[PDB]
RNA sequence: GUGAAGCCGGCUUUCUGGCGUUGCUUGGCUGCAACUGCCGUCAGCCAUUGAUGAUCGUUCUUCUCUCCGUAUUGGGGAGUGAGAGGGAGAGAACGCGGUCUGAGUGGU
């Protein structure tokens, strides 16, 4: 008997998948904590104002 | 509850349910070797192989193409520490095959001859791999070369290896850490340069995958030794 | 065809079997569908609790930073605070340095 | 030549450690259970 | 996806060691770098012009590089100076 | 646990019983054998329970099957048949499950 037609069936109709937030948690917590394992108003606003204005 | 899946490589399986784990049939049914849990189908028990510890299960789960270690092999492990990833190759190979484990540590050869006490297959070596010839009495001609030994002049150890116990044809299995060959160069080109050295030796690289999701800077490199002509 | 494996099975990088492997084996265990939707359920609840126990230990780990931290403070030798306390961190402080006697 | 190479002897081994206490605790709740019948047994005889 | 999977030939992708490079880099830093005192040919084979009873001008006189536009309008203005 | 009802046969033994099947034979309603195969008939003997306890108690999946057969969508029955599930005992591996603190004390 052949079962190449029942075993295509089974092997991708069951696509499931975890979240992107889960994933990226988890692949954090195993890098560690160490040192080496871890990763609207400027100066010129203020100055000519004041030179303007109270200079 | 648990659904079985068989795997592209013989004597791997893929185990689903309740948990998502890549699985080898279990040599000593009852026993666990590092704490990895083991579930039962029906009679067949199978382990978990984590690929967060294991390197060659990270190279399964990441789509390598062959890995060549299959039942009645013998296969020479260097770099064999406490044992867990050779726990699984005796599991493949099965009564028929033999597994080397080459470690030079004391303290993880421990591990081993406790290991090696409960598995008849599995042969404990408690020796230096960079000389090959201190050993020779030990290892017969063997089938695949697995090497793990992460160490700057990983090629020549294989090499020395390879001439005096690996058959003709043979396969290696050898894996690279990128900033162990050398920490201020980029990993592609680290990679790369160690193509260049294996094909020095008669050794053909056939193929060559990233171990990205499970660790960081890791290649695993599969090729023939002395292909027949 | 370099594999061997159906284009479908491409797409699955964790387990592509090969064409006469897949006519020669046979899945095991569960096969039906309503059991299919039970695993799948499965699926989630145990990865949602992986993850809400590592999210667990990044707050256990902050905490007891921060109360290590306070205990430093019980010191009379004389400090300069150079960052202020944070939710992931605690405040960063410079001791003057005296030998212990 | 793995115990040879991890110097593992007849003298380091201390597994005959943890054998003999555990086996010294057996013996004397055997001890234990064992007078008892002797006392409980000859008391219905020369109880004094 | 095609761009995950790559075919190459075993003899095409061997290249210039990055490691080599540096190593040529550091030799071209240390000899000919910022910080030396280095001249040209041009200027070191002039020094001999200037003390000769006959003084001449550089060895090589025509910078060919210096210029290329402002060459051709010389030639203009000359060409106009004749009339 | 319940508490009064169940079951109805054997061996000798005539009528030189019949009814049958299964193989071989046969010119022939021919013979030869086998039956752990049925229905008798004719007389004789033998045995013939229970308050000192009659009667009555099991889920699932399957096969080894078997007989009726509604043989076509069947049904039953007998299985020391297998396991699954439940109860009791004896082991092994693993888990709950995580190993106080950290610079001052005493004399003068």
Redesign the interface.
């Known amino acids: 008997r052949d079962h190449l037609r029942v075993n295509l069936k089974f092997l991708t109709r069951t696509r499931s998948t975890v979240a992107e937030s889960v994933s990226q948690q988890i692949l954090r917590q195993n890098r560690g904590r160490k040192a080496c394992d871890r990763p609207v108003f400027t100066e010129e606003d203020f100055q000519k104002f004041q030179q303007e204005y109270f200079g | 509850n648990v659904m079985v899946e068989p795997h592209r490589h013989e004597g791997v399986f893929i185990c689903r349910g309740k948990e998502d784990a890549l699985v080898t049939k279990n040599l000593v049914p009852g026993e666990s070797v590092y704490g990895e849990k083991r579930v039962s189908i029906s009679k067949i028990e199978y382990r978990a192989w984590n690929p967060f510890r294991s390197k060659l299960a990270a190279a399964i789960l990441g789509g390598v193409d062959q890995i060549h270690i299959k039942p009645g092999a013998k296969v020479l492990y260097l770099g064999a520490a406490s044992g867990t990833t050779v726990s699984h190759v005796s599991d493949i190979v099965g009564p028929d095959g033999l597994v080397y484990a080459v470690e030079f540590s004391h303290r993880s050869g421990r591990d081993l001859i406790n290991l090696a006490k409960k598995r008849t297959n599995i042969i404990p070596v408690i020796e230096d791999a960079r000389h090959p010839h201190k050993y020779r009495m030990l290892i017969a001609m063997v089938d695949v070369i697995f090497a793990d030994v992460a160490q700057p002049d990983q090629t020549r150890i294989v090499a020395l290896n390879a001439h005096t116990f690996l058959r003709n044809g043979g396969h290696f299995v050898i894996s690279i850490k990128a900033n162990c060959i050398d920490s201020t160069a980029s990993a592609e080109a680290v990679f790369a340069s160690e193509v260049k050295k294996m094909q020095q030796e008669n050794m053909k690289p056939q193929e060559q995958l990233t171990l990205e999701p499970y660790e960081r800077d890791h290649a695993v490199v599969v090729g023939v030794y002395r292909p027949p002509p | 065809t370099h594999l061997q494996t159906a284009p479908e099975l491409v797409d699955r990088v964790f387990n592509r079997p090969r064409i006469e492997t897949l006519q020669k084996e046979k899945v095991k265990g569960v096969t039906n569908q309503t059991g299919l939707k039970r695993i799948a359920k499965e699926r989630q609840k145990q990865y949602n609790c992986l993850t809400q126990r590592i999210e667990r230990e990044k707050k256990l780990f902050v905490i007891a930073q921060k109360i290590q931290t306070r205990k430093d403070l019980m010191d009379k030798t004389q400090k300069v605070k150079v960052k202020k306390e944070t939710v992931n961190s605690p405040a960063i402080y410079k001791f003057q340095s005296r030998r212990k006697r | 030549l793995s115990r040879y190479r991890l110097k593992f002897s007849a003298d380091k081994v201390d597994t005959m450690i943890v054998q003999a206490i555990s086996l010294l605790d057996d013996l004397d709740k055997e001890l234990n259970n064992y007078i008892m019948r002797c006392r409980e047994w000859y008391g219905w005889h020369f109880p004094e | 996806q095609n761009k995950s999977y790559l075919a190459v030939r ?1 003899k095409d ?3 210039r ?3 080599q490079q540096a190593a040529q880099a550091f030799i071209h830093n240390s000899l000919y770098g910022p910080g030396t005192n280095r001249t040209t040919v041009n200027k070191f084979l002039s020094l001999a012009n200037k003390r000769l009873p006959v003084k001449r001008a550089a060895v090589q006189f025509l910078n060919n590089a210096w210029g290329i536009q402002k060459k051709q309008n010389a030639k203009r203005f000359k060409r106009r100076w004749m009339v």
């Open positions: 075993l992708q061997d290249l060691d990055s490691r």
